[PDB]
Amino acid sequence: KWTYFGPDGENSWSKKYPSCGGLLQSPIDLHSDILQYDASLTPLEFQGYNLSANKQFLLTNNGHSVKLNLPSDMHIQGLQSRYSATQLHLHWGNPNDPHGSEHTVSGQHFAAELHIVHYNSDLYPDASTASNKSEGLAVLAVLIEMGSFNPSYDKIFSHLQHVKYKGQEAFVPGFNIEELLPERTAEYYRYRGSLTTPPCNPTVLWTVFRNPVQISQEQLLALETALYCTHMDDPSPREMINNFRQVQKFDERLVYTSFS
Amino acid sequence: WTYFGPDGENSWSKKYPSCGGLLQSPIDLHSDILQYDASLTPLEFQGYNLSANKQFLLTNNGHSVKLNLPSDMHIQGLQSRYSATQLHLHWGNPNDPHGSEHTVSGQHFAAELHIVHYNSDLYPDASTASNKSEGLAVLAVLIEMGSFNPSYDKIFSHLQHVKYKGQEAFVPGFNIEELLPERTAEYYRYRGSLTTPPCNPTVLWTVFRNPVQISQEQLLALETALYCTHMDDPSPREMINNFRQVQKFDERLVYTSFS
Ligand SMILES: CC(=O)Nc1nnc(S(N)(=O)=O)s1
Ligand SMILES: CC(=O)Nc1nnc(S(N)(=O)=O)s1
Ligand SMILES: [Zn+2]
Ligand SMILES: [Zn+2]
């Protein structure tokens, strides 16, 4: 068992999960000294992202975040291999410190961060098998900041009060996932990293979009207050907050950008 | 332990339990956790003008370069008297010269100086005080690249003498107060820990608000003059990026002596 605070917190993950203390760890801070423009970084193509409204997708509180299961028919085109979706989830802070993104830019956190996880379907049958193997995963990261109300993100957030406790699930009708992506997706940061949660396998090709999306103060507060990492029948509930990993050392390396 | 590799910071907790415990330092000094406190009056640095006729030990311990300080120098202004034991530094590398431990509004500084003191009213020495309540007080000075600093050079000029792990050299006494920034009355104050194993949560931190400046040449010397390996080692390793990543610090338990 692992957590984001306490005895089983991130500084202790390496005890049970060796890779968490290994190489190519994520997340990292994106700042000028280690950024480099690469004109070869072309735009990714998002296929099958417009999920059928006649299909239902499982939303689950897994005790670490709120996740939405995604179908393998939606995928990313533009990488060396085809990567098919498996799930999306988020990371956030808390009402008193609403800056819980995992990746930071010039030392600055964003309010939250969305991760759309994909696995190499050309080499592996599923995300489980691909997770601990070479070039097994590709994650898209969307930085989130407080601003205007976001109807698209609310297609997920409107169900939060129904997955308040660990293990609980709800069904979300399909909608266009591309609606969760920011403007100018052609502009992004790219680097080889790891899962930001145990086992921390260094098998993730990260793509962090340059521009953030906005959600309202109310939407952000709901995300920061509606969930608990404990079961509903728990006499001592524990709020699911600050579920992001601290940035990791990033030395002798460069993060390449598709923008100058 | 080291600052990189299997024995790196994410693995410190395997051998040193407190590194995975509470009140860990360093932290990001940002508005969300700050709180102005008028009770935080100016500290007085006594006995800091070390006799130029006396020599003080400079040592490369494989983790940093440290200078031993006499117990007669101490901080005045805190509840108990804290006597000095040593000072040392933390820095980054030439390609990414941002190796301070603490950050301000998410920003790292080029380097950071720590002047370590122990509670001499409660404990007999630094070693005994290290893992006990109210045992330590560290003064942190943020360092950025700028104009040449003659005072810091009183230390840097001796770096080649302690180039390798285990090496020692003598440094004539000078006024340590010269290493402090302007307006020392302005600082951040919080209860934290040692930033290296055993990471004991016994440190009262005082991070001065304003940074000092050292020249690009001084910073480069610091980033390239030392090795964490012994003299003539078959695989020499440069001493760089010897700082710990910032730790989560939830509650607004960081106080400032300024508004
Ligand atoms: C989806 C899956 O199999 N697990 C993951 N664990 N952490 C992930 S993250 N935060 O790096 O995107 S994805
Ligand atoms: C002084 C001493 O014996 N050890 C120290 N270890 N870490 C220290 S720090 N980086 O928190 O100031 S001081
Ligand atoms: Zn994630
Ligand atoms: Zn130190």
**8 Å CB contact between A78 and A42:** yes
Q: How far apart are CA A209 and CA A211, in angstroms?
A: 6
Q: Which two tokens stand for residue B84?
A: 């000095």
> Any idea how long chain B is?
259
Q: What H or E segment, with its residue span, contains residue B35?
A: strand B34-36
Q: Count the helices and strands in chain A (H runs, E runs).
A: 4, 15
Q: Checking DSSP bridges between strand B187-192 and strand A35-37, what pairing results, if any?
A: unpaired
Q: How far is A175 from chain B (nearest CA, A)?
A: 36
* Vertex A97 angle, CA A93 and A103, to 5°: 50
Q: Give the helix/strand (H/E) hosting B219.
A: helix B216-224
Nearest CA in chain A to B27: A246
In this structure, the number of other CB atoms found within 10 A of the CB of residue B215 comes to 16
Would you say B242 and B1 are in contact if contact means Cβ atoms under 8 Å apart?
no
Under an 8 A CB cutoff, do B252 and A21 touch? no
Which amino acid would we find at residue B48?
Answer: Y
Amino acid letter at B142? L
Helix (H) or strand (E) holding B13: helix B12-15
> How many Å apart are CA A57 and CA A55, to the nearest integer?
7
Does A131 sit in the ligand 1 pocket, CB within 6 Å?
yes
Beta strands in chain A (DSSP E): 29-30, 35-37, 45-47, 56-61, 66-69, 75-77, 83-92, 104-105, 112-120, 137-146, 169-173, 188-193, 204-209, 213-215, 255-257
Which method was it determined by?
Answer: X-ray
Q: How many CB atoms lie within 10 A of CB B35?
A: 13
Tokens of B136: 């330590």
Resolution, expressed in angstroms to one decimal: 1.5
Identify the burial level of B53 via C-beta atoms within 10 angstroms of its C-beta, where 0-12 means exposed, 13-18 middle and 19 or more buried.
Answer: exposed
Interface test with B, best of A97, A238, A252, A255 (most B CBs within 10 A): A97
Closest CA to B100 of B112, B113, B115, B116: B112
Which residues on chain A are in Cβ contact (under 8 Å) with B241?
Answer: 249, 251
Q: Is B161 annotated as a binding residue?
A: no
A28, closest residue in chain B (CA to CA): B245
Residues 7-46 of A with CB under 8 A from B: 7, 9-15, 20-22, 25, 31, 33-34
Q: CB–CB of B209/B187 below 8 Å?
A: yes
Contacts of B160 (CB under 8 A, 6+ apart): B225
**CA A35 from centroid of its chain's CA atoms:** 21
Classify burial at A248, counting beta carbons within 10 Å of its beta carbon; exposed 0-12, middle 13-18, buried 19 or more.
Answer: buried
Query: Chain A partners of B8 at a C-beta cutoff of 8 Å?
Result: 21, 249
Residue B211 contacts residue B181 (beta carbons within 8 Å): yes
Contact by Cβ (8 Å): A135, A203: yes
What's the rounded Cα separation, in Å, for the pair A27 and A250?
Answer: 9
* Distance in angstroms (rounded) separating the CA atoms of residues B49 and B173: 8
Rounded Cα gap, residues A16 and A11, in angstroms: 11
Determine whether the interchain pair B250/A94 forms a contact, defined as Cβ–Cβ distance below 8 Å.
yes
Could you identify the residue written with the tokens 């990033």? A250
Query: Is the Cβ–Cβ distance between A17 and A198 less than 8 Å?
Result: yes
User: What's the Rg (C-alpha) of chain B?
Assistant: 17
**Residue A110's closest chain B neighbor by CA?**
B106
The pair of three-digit structure tokens given for residue A142, joined into one six-digit string: 């969307």
Closest residue of A to B29, CA-based?
A: A107
Cα B170 to chain centroid distance, Å, stands at 20
Q: Is the peptide bond before A43 cis (omega within 30 degrees of 0)?
A: no
Among B158, B246, B155, B253, CA closest to B204: B253
Tell which residue, A258, A241, A253, has the closest CA to residue A111: A241
Mutate to test the pocket of ligand 2, among B1, B88, B190 (most ligand atoms within 8 A of CB): B88
Residue span of the structural domain in which A231 resides: 1-260
The runs of H, that is alpha helices, within chain A are: 13-16, 127-130, 154-157, 217-225
Task: Pull the structure tokens for residue B95.
Answer: 């390609």
Measured from the Cα of A26, ligand 1's closest atom is 11
CA of B66 to the centre of ligand 2 (A): 10
Q: How far A119 CA sits from the closest chain B CA (Å)? A: 27
Q: In angstroms, rounded to a whole number, what is the distance separating the alpha carbons of residues B12 and B184?
A: 33
Q: Match 């390239």 to its residue by tokens.
A: B224
CA–CA gap between residue A148 and residue B132 (Å, rounded): 50
Check: CB of residue A143 under 8 Å from CB of residue A134.
no
Cβ B193 vs Cβ B242: under 8 Å: no
Q: What is the DSSP letter of B155?
A: H
Q: What is the CATH number of the domain that holds B138?
A: 3.10.200.10
How many structural domains are present in chain B?
Answer: 1
| Interface list for A 212-251 with B (CB within 8 A) | 242, 246-249, 251
Pairwise CA distance, residues A251 & B245, whole Å:
13
Q: How far is B170 from chain A (nearest CA, A)?
A: 33
How far is Cα A208 from Cα A258, in angstroms, rounded to an integer? 11
Listed residue (A57, A90, A91, A79) closest to A175, CA to CA: A57
Cα A96 to Cα B249: distance, rounded to the nearest angstrom: 12
Chain A contact for B96, CB < 8 A?
yes
Q: Which atom of ligand 2 is nearest to the CA of B126?
A: 3
Chain B residues closer than 8 Å to A23 by CB: none
The token pair that represents B194 in the structure block: 């040692």
- Test site for ligand 2: of B63, B138, B246, most ligand atoms within 8 A of the Cβ: B138
Q: In a mutational test of the pocket of ligand 1, which residue from A65, A89, A207 has the highest number of ligand atoms less than 8 Å from its CB?
A: A89
Active site residues of B: 63
Contacts of B221 (CB under 8 A, 6+ apart): B156, B159
